[PDB]
Design a protein around this ligand. Sequence first.
Ligand SMILES: *[C@@H]1O[C@H](CO)[C@@H](O[C@@H]2O[C@H](CO)[C@@H](O[C@@H]3O[C@H](CO[C@H]4O[C@H](CO)[C@@H](O)[C@H](O)[C@@H]4O)[C@@H](O)[C@H](O[C@H]4O[C@H](CO)[C@@H](O)[C@H](O)[C@@H]4O[C@H]4O[C@H](CO)[C@@H](O)[C@H](O)[C@@H]4O[C@H]4O[C@H](CO)[C@@H](O)[C@H](O)[C@@H]4O)[C@@H]3O)[C@H](O)[C@H]2NC(C)=O)[C@H](O)[C@H]1NC(C)=O
Ligand SMILES: *[C@@H]1O[C@H](CO)[C@@H](O[C@@H]2O[C@H](CO)[C@@H](O[C@@H]3O[C@H](CO[C@H]4O[C@H](CO)[C@@H](O)[C@H](O[C@H]5O[C@H](CO)[C@@H](O)[C@H](O)[C@@H]5O)[C@@H]4O)[C@@H](O)[C@H](O[C@H]4O[C@H](CO)[C@@H](O)[C@H](O)[C@@H]4O)[C@@H]3O)[C@H](O)[C@H]2NC(C)=O)[C@H](O)[C@H]1NC(C)=O
Ligand SMILES: *[C@@H]1O[C@H](CO)[C@@H](O[C@@H]2O[C@H](CO)[C@@H](O[C@@H]3O[C@H](CO)[C@@H](O)[C@H](O)[C@@H]3O)[C@H](O)[C@H]2NC(C)=O)[C@H](O)[C@H]1NC(C)=O
Ligand SMILES: *[C@@H]1O[C@H](CO)[C@@H](O[C@@H]2O[C@H](CO)[C@@H](O[C@@H]3O[C@H](CO)[C@@H](O)[C@H](O)[C@@H]3O)[C@H](O)[C@H]2NC(C)=O)[C@H](O)[C@H]1NC(C)=O
Ligand SMILES: *[C@@H]1O[C@H](CO)[C@@H](O[C@@H]2O[C@H](CO)[C@@H](O[C@@H]3O[C@H](CO)[C@@H](O)[C@H](O)[C@@H]3O)[C@H](O)[C@H]2NC(C)=O)[C@H](O)[C@H]1NC(C)=O
Ligand SMILES: *[C@@H]1O[C@H](CO)[C@@H](O[C@@H]2O[C@H](CO)[C@@H](O)[C@H](O)[C@H]2NC(C)=O)[C@H](O)[C@H]1NC(C)=O
Ligand SMILES: *[C@@H]1O[C@H](CO)[C@@H](O[C@@H]2O[C@H](CO)[C@@H](O)[C@H](O)[C@H]2NC(C)=O)[C@H](O)[C@H]1NC(C)=O
Ligand SMILES: *[C@@H]1O[C@H](CO)[C@@H](O[C@@H]2O[C@H](CO)[C@@H](O)[C@H](O)[C@H]2NC(C)=O)[C@H](O)[C@H]1NC(C)=O
Ligand SMILES: *[C@@H]1O[C@H](CO[C@@H]2O[C@@H](C)[C@@H](O)[C@@H](O)[C@@H]2O)[C@@H](O)[C@H](O)[C@H]1NC(C)=O
Ligand SMILES: *[C@@H]1O[C@H](CO)[C@@H](O)[C@H](O)[C@H]1NC(C)=O
Ligand SMILES: *[C@@H]1O[C@H](CO)[C@@H](O)[C@H](O)[C@H]1NC(C)=O
Ligand SMILES: *[C@@H]1O[C@H](CO)[C@@H](O)[C@H](O)[C@H]1NC(C)=O
Ligand SMILES: *[C@@H]1O[C@H](CO)[C@@H](O)[C@H](O)[C@H]1NC(C)=O
Ligand SMILES: *[C@@H]1O[C@H](CO)[C@@H](O)[C@H](O)[C@H]1NC(C)=O
Ligand SMILES: *[C@@H]1O[C@H](CO)[C@@H](O)[C@H](O)[C@H]1NC(C)=O
Ligand SMILES: *[C@@H]1O[C@H](CO)[C@@H](O)[C@H](O)[C@H]1NC(C)=O
Ligand SMILES: *[C@@H]1O[C@H](CO)[C@@H](O)[C@H](O)[C@H]1NC(C)=O
Ligand SMILES: *[C@@H]1O[C@H](CO)[C@@H](O)[C@H](O)[C@H]1NC(C)=O
Ligand SMILES: *[C@@H]1O[C@H](CO)[C@@H](O)[C@H](O)[C@H]1NC(C)=O
Ligand SMILES: *[C@@H]1O[C@H](CO)[C@@H](O)[C@H](O)[C@H]1NC(C)=O
Ligand SMILES: *[C@@H]1O[C@H](CO)[C@@H](O)[C@H](O)[C@H]1NC(C)=O
Lengths: 130, 126, 120, 117, 441
Amino acid sequence: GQLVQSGAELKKPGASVKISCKTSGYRFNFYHINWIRQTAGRGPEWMGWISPYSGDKNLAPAFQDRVIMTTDTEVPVTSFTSTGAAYMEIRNLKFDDTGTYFCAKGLLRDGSSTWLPYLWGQGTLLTVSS
Amino acid sequence: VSLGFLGAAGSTMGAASITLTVQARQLLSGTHWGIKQLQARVLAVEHYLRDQQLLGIWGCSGKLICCTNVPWNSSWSNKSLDEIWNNMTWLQWDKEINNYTQLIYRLIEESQNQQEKNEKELLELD
Amino acid sequence: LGFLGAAGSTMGAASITLTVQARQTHWGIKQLQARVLAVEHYLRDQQLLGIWGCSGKLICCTNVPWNSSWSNKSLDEIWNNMTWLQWDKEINNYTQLIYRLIEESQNQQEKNEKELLELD
Amino acid sequence: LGFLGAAGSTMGAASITLTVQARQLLSHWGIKQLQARVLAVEHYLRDQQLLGIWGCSGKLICCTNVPWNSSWSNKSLDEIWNNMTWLQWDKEINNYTQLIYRLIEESQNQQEKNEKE
Amino acid sequence: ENLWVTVYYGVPVWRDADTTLFCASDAKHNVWATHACVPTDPNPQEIHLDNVTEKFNMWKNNMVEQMHEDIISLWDQSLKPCVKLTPLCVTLHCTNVTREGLKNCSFNMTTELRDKRQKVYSLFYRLDIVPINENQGSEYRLINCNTSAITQACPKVSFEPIPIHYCTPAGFAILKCKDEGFNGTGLCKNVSTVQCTHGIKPVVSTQLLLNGSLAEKNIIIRSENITNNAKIIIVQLVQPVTIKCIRPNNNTVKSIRIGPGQAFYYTGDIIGDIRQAHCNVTRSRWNKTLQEVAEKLRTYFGNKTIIFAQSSGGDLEITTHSFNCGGEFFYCNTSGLFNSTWYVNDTITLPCRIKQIINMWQRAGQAMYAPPIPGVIKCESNITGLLLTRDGGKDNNVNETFRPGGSDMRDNWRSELYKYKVVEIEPLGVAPTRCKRRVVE
Ligand SMILES: *[C@@H]1O[C@H](CO)[C@@H](O[C@@H]2O[C@H](CO)[C@@H](O[C@@H]3O[C@H](CO[C@H]4O[C@H](CO)[C@@H](O)[C@H](O)[C@@H]4O)[C@@H](O)[C@H](O[C@H]4O[C@H](CO)[C@@H](O)[C@H](O)[C@@H]4O[C@H]4O[C@H](CO)[C@@H](O)[C@H](O)[C@@H]4O[C@H]4O[C@H](CO)[C@@H](O)[C@H](O)[C@@H]4O)[C@@H]3O)[C@H](O)[C@H]2NC(C)=O)[C@H](O)[C@H]1NC(C)=O
Ligand SMILES: *[C@@H]1O[C@H](CO)[C@@H](O[C@@H]2O[C@H](CO)[C@@H](O[C@@H]3O[C@H](CO[C@H]4O[C@H](CO)[C@@H](O)[C@H](O[C@H]5O[C@H](CO)[C@@H](O)[C@H](O)[C@@H]5O)[C@@H]4O)[C@@H](O)[C@H](O[C@H]4O[C@H](CO)[C@@H](O)[C@H](O)[C@@H]4O)[C@@H]3O)[C@H](O)[C@H]2NC(C)=O)[C@H](O)[C@H]1NC(C)=O
Ligand SMILES: *[C@@H]1O[C@H](CO)[C@@H](O[C@@H]2O[C@H](CO)[C@@H](O[C@@H]3O[C@H](CO)[C@@H](O)[C@H](O)[C@@H]3O)[C@H](O)[C@H]2NC(C)=O)[C@H](O)[C@H]1NC(C)=O
Ligand SMILES: *[C@@H]1O[C@H](CO)[C@@H](O[C@@H]2O[C@H](CO)[C@@H](O[C@@H]3O[C@H](CO)[C@@H](O)[C@H](O)[C@@H]3O)[C@H](O)[C@H]2NC(C)=O)[C@H](O)[C@H]1NC(C)=O
Ligand SMILES: *[C@@H]1O[C@H](CO)[C@@H](O[C@@H]2O[C@H](CO)[C@@H](O[C@@H]3O[C@H](CO)[C@@H](O)[C@H](O)[C@@H]3O)[C@H](O)[C@H]2NC(C)=O)[C@H](O)[C@H]1NC(C)=O
Ligand SMILES: *[C@@H]1O[C@H](CO)[C@@H](O[C@@H]2O[C@H](CO)[C@@H](O)[C@H](O)[C@H]2NC(C)=O)[C@H](O)[C@H]1NC(C)=O
Ligand SMILES: *[C@@H]1O[C@H](CO)[C@@H](O[C@@H]2O[C@H](CO)[C@@H](O)[C@H](O)[C@H]2NC(C)=O)[C@H](O)[C@H]1NC(C)=O
Ligand SMILES: *[C@@H]1O[C@H](CO)[C@@H](O[C@@H]2O[C@H](CO)[C@@H](O)[C@H](O)[C@H]2NC(C)=O)[C@H](O)[C@H]1NC(C)=O
Ligand SMILES: *[C@@H]1O[C@H](CO[C@@H]2O[C@@H](C)[C@@H](O)[C@@H](O)[C@@H]2O)[C@@H](O)[C@H](O)[C@H]1NC(C)=O
Ligand SMILES: *[C@@H]1O[C@H](CO)[C@@H](O)[C@H](O)[C@H]1NC(C)=O
Ligand SMILES: *[C@@H]1O[C@H](CO)[C@@H](O)[C@H](O)[C@H]1NC(C)=O
Ligand SMILES: *[C@@H]1O[C@H](CO)[C@@H](O)[C@H](O)[C@H]1NC(C)=O
Ligand SMILES: *[C@@H]1O[C@H](CO)[C@@H](O)[C@H](O)[C@H]1NC(C)=O
Ligand SMILES: *[C@@H]1O[C@H](CO)[C@@H](O)[C@H](O)[C@H]1NC(C)=O
Ligand SMILES: *[C@@H]1O[C@H](CO)[C@@H](O)[C@H](O)[C@H]1NC(C)=O
Ligand SMILES: *[C@@H]1O[C@H](CO)[C@@H](O)[C@H](O)[C@H]1NC(C)=O
Ligand SMILES: *[C@@H]1O[C@H](CO)[C@@H](O)[C@H](O)[C@H]1NC(C)=O
Ligand SMILES: *[C@@H]1O[C@H](CO)[C@@H](O)[C@H](O)[C@H]1NC(C)=O
Ligand SMILES: *[C@@H]1O[C@H](CO)[C@@H](O)[C@H](O)[C@H]1NC(C)=O
Ligand SMILES: *[C@@H]1O[C@H](CO)[C@@H](O)[C@H](O)[C@H]1NC(C)=O
Ligand SMILES: *[C@@H]1O[C@H](CO)[C@@H](O)[C@H](O)[C@H]1NC(C)=O
């Protein structure tokens, strides 16, 4: 499976940004899509996850008021694979939010650890400046 | 709360094991037209018995789930149990081992015959 | 007695005879249909027993609890005061429900037995 | 090996191949074809019904409680299992086979009565 | 770890398979013999399959082949007890009826007794009549005489379509595609399982699909290959277009004995003015329908100008639309329907003719004589889809041309069976577990 993301762009403080995550080679609806942030002053941090199957999402308390996650309807390629995309929107950007943002694929369809980010996209840089 | 017939087909293999009885039941239940109906009835019987013939030979008859003494060969699949039971449908799994299905069946039959031979000998020694 | 000879006897009395009853161009076409029909009925009953795990036994206890709504009768009222024909009428609307419950219990039992073996 | 490849083998040696023959018992002119298909099914089921009656269902080898009658054969186990084929064996007891089958059925009937208690 | 094979029975899997299907039907006889069918379940079951995507291909669907063979076999079964009409192939003397749609013919027919003959006067449709090669113009023969004997349809047996539910043998299942935009091929996201199909009426028609199912939201255009003009294009309409058909002629039907156990039915007279049979399609509704079809065709053809045109010519059975109404077989000129041109930017009356000697499946050596139906016939039907073909051989970047009909009768069944696929259920499967079998003693 493979994941790719929207390219890096510069934003003003308070601006919104939307990051796409196109996927292929696996069934989109079978796995959770995770979003994870890394910054130099914080290290890795979860922004929560969304299930394309039910539309349910679990947002981390830090991001509940600033992050919205949505998904596209999957388009099949083979009986066992499909294409589709997840999107994340961040509002009220601050300089503290600068860093690399990653899209990642859930680990299992069942069991205790289904949402773990087994596959990661390359990730892209978000920059904030006035 | 049942998913209905084949409702589990899209489920993971582990989840699907919950519904085996749904599929097991109705295998028998679900003039030009008259002959076609007769052929349909005979065919359904042959279909049902084909699988039962294998189970009786394997010693698995009367059971929905039957453990055996035949070791798994990594060449049939190198997947871990989590990769199989929690990440696959049975439809996907059958394709992965489609070339080995008959090989496995013969190994099960050989193991059953040796087991019964040994059980008899253990009783003869008593 | 004989085949169905117990039919007028009580359900409990009949239990001894289950072993006995467990057993059993134009014309040629009808015989073919007759032969197929006999096979379908034999297998229909065996299919249910195999799923229930009761195969090979005339009497098979299960883990499904009796629901008083199916019948509020005591065992003495059922086993000694009724024929199987009378009993069949009393549970005619619940028979399929009972069958599904037996099947669900069998699958849960085998799943649990598998897990016990995995731990050994 | 192969279907009936053991037929000329000693009865003891032949027992290793029972599964080979147990399998493939199953699998106008439309009527003719159906009669043959039904016949194959009836013969398969006939044998399975006998095993169910004998309490031997699901087993390739099934021990019973019926004692061997020396009048059926006076041959030792070593003579039977290592010096005979199954084809020869069936001929020696061909006239007692139905008697043996009835005795097995009677023994199961007694066992069922005991299990009920 | 040490893993062992474990056997599972009742595993929810399937593989594609071809198996004999049998009819079922909802609880005076009909050619389809639906009374022989298994009664339908009063509460049919359907199971939605979540997380299942499956490949469908209507063009390779063998349910179509079975239905086609069933329809032919039943048709023949209905004709076996019926009158052979072998004595009917005679020299006819014919004159104009007191347009040449009809001729008044005279012949010496056989009777109950071998030594006796009777003179018979009868009206025949010109389509059923062939001039004697002597070309005197006064003598004729029936069209079948150099080809086949004609079996008369039995007058008591109806040709009316009755829905047929196709059911698969136990141990097999029929998958149904529910996707709203489904074109009959490719992957279907919404898949469900049924024991039987929805009832399908065995409607036989040549250019327009009548009394079939409707598309739920949009017009769906289906083809094995749109770019290949040879392939038939099946168009399913969202809305029905009402078509009304009438035979104004008031027939008086007479009958004579041919021989013991046999009789011939023929039109003895016509009451009132003789008038041509016709069908009516509302013009405004039809033009709306064609526009919507053209809009969908332009999507596949690069927004080229869409031209509709009349049939290519050749035999009447192909070049005209046909249907069974009132038991009579009609052939209608559809050039009035397909004469439009569309760009990116009252009623239509279709002339019809009636033919009594037909060969619906185009089989050599076969023919049927429909008996005339007395009085005046009127009926109404819904156009629910179109059969189109395309003119190839052109590199033009402006025009595309479409014409009605096609050579293959099997394509009618495809318009209803595209949803369905037949699969075999395989209860056994094997997968590794940690479980090891215990051995007694
Ligand atoms: C597309 O779909 C549409 C919608 O489904 C289809 O439209 C339907 O098409 C049907 C077939 O044409 C049609 O059914 C026929 O209707 C005729 C007219 O019915 C109306 O008038 C009669 C008489 O007043 C009313 O009783 C009735 O309620 C209606 O108002 C009927 O006459 C037809 O029945 C007769 O023909 C059929 C065969 O087609 C026979 O099986 C049947 O027995 C009838 O024939 C006998 O009776 C007539 C007189 O009624 C005699 O003329 C004839 O010789 C027969 O006589 C024998 O039997 C009678 C007893 O029945 C006995 O007394 C006598 O002595 C003889 O022994 C038939 O019911 C639908 O009405 C029509 N629907 C609509 C809404 O219009 C359309 O066709 C489809 N298109 C295609 C291509 O399939
Ligand atoms: C079709 O395909 C889909 C996708 O593959 C299948 O969906 C998968 O089904 C399995 C069924 O077991 C799921 O496994 C479980 O996953 C959950 C994950 O938690 C999430 O889902 C909950 C759904 O109710 C939801 O409640 C959770 O979120 C709420 O609650 C939390 C906690 O309060 C909160 O933080 C959130 O904000 C929400 O309010 C959350 O979104 C997991 O919890 C389950 O654990 C139990 O079960 C396992 C297995 O027995 C067991 O090991 C555990 O100990 C525990 O008992 C379980 O792991 C899987 O997540 C589904 N996948 C997706 C992508 O949704 C579907 O089943 C398929 N259909 C068919 C017909 O086969
Ligand atoms: C076909 O018939 C021949 C002759 O009866 C069979 O030959 C016998 O085969 C068995 C093995 O299947 C031999 O058994 C072994 O003998 C040695 C001693 O020679 C002993 O040490 C071993 O433990 C074992 O018992 C047997 O000797 C041999 N007989 C002869 C005379 O050579 C042959 O097997 C038959 N084939 C089949 C497939 O049944
Ligand atoms: C019916 O719907 C299905 C699903 O939408 C259509 O299948 C897919 O159609 C596309 C074209 O729209 C095919 O793409 C092809 O890609 C190759 C390059 O890889 C290109 O050379 C072709 O010209 C074409 O664009 C795609 O393969 C096809 N998928 C399958 C599985 O066949 C289908 O075409 C539709 N049918 C009709 C008659 O429109
Ligand atoms: C198909 O369409 C045509 C054209 O609209 C329909 O023809 C018309 O049918 C009506 C029926 O009442 C005719 O009305 C009467 O005709 C007689 C003829 O002698 C006249 O004396 C009456 O005053 C009255 O006009 C009308 O003339 C006729 N139009 C033409 C041009 O012939 C036809 O009925 C439609 N067919 C069906 C099955 O609906
Ligand atoms: C659909 O039909 C078109 C037309 O027949 C096929 O394309 C042609 O393929 C041959 C291959 O040798 C070429 O020589 C032609 O030039 C092609 N025609 C055009 C108009 O491009 C096409 O391959 C068919 N599609 C499928 C899937 O069979
Ligand atoms: C078909 O042709 C015959 C022969 O010309 C017509 O028969 C005559 O019909 C009239 C009534 O219209 C009778 O009075 C005569 O006796 C008939 N002649 C014979 C020899 O039977 C018949 O009418 C024509 N049919 C039609 C519809 O015109
Ligand atoms: C349907 O009706 C049209 C009415 O015009 C018929 O049209 C003629 O067809 C011939 C075919 O060779 C052309 O040469 C003519 O030009 C057409 N019309 C005229 C006025 O010339 C058409 O043939 C009919 N179709 C059928 C199958 O009978
Ligand atoms: C789960 O499966 C994902 C998709 O891979 C497909 O399914 C697996 C089980 C294999 O059969 C593979 O060949 C198929 O293409 C994987 O991307 C994902 O990593 C898997 N998860 C784990 C934990 O293995
Ligand atoms: C495993 O499979 C290989 C062939 O791929 C075979 O040679 C080997 O003997 C197998 N091992 C067992 C234990 O069956
Ligand atoms: C089965 O064998 C064929 C070659 O005969 C091969 O193409 C196919 O990939 C094999 N299937 C699997 C699941 O290995
Ligand atoms: C008996 O059946 C009823 C059906 O509604 C159910 O509510 C009740 O819990 C059942 N009783 C037991 C003991 O299972
Ligand atoms: C079962 O239902 C029937 C009606 O279908 C009714 O006559 C009968 O009394 C019911 N039985 C019980 C025990 O309620
Ligand atoms: C019958 O009509 C045709 C067509 O008008 C004509 O050629 C022929 O001469 C007519 N026959 C008679 C006898 O008038
Ligand atoms: C029928 O027989 C009569 C006998 O006189 C003859 O005149 C007449 O031409 C015959 N009709 C036909 C069509 O042969
Ligand atoms: C039968 O006669 C018709 C007369 O039009 C002719 O078209 C047809 O080809 C003939 N059939 C044969 C087999 O000669
Ligand atoms: C699948 O089709 C059924 C048809 O009734 C519809 O109700 C259901 O919502 C569909 N599922 C999806 C995901 O569209
Ligand atoms: C077909 O279209 C042409 C061009 O508009 C027109 O001249 C002709 O009359 C039309 N034919 C019919 C039957 O309407
Ligand atoms: C046709 O003519 C007959 C003559 O008896 C009459 O009874 C019948 O009603 C007529 N049909 C129509 C539609 O006028
Ligand atoms: C044709 O469509 C109309 C609605 O426009 C409907 O009332 C009628 O029953 C339909 N006819 C058939 C045969 O379905
Ligand atoms: C397109 O069709 C029109 C008739 O509708 C015709 O006049 C024109 O020449 C055609 N164009 C080409 C390039 O063939």
